[PDB]
Design a protein around this ligand. Structure first.
Ligand SMILES: [Cd+2]
Ligand SMILES: [Cd+2]
Ligand SMILES: [Cd+2]
Length: 31
């Protein structure tokens, strides 16, 4: 489940940028 900024706004292109808006693969970032 993606946070409140990943819904229509997933900004993580990879787990590297994922450490910026989240800490793990929400339901949209990488696997
Ligand atoms: Cd997220
Ligand atoms: Cd993320
Ligand atoms: Cd995401």
């Amino acid at each position: 489940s993606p946070c409140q900024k990943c819904t229509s706004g997933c900004k993580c292109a990879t787990k590297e940028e994922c450490s910026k808006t989240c800490t793990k693969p929400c339901s949209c970032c990488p696997k």
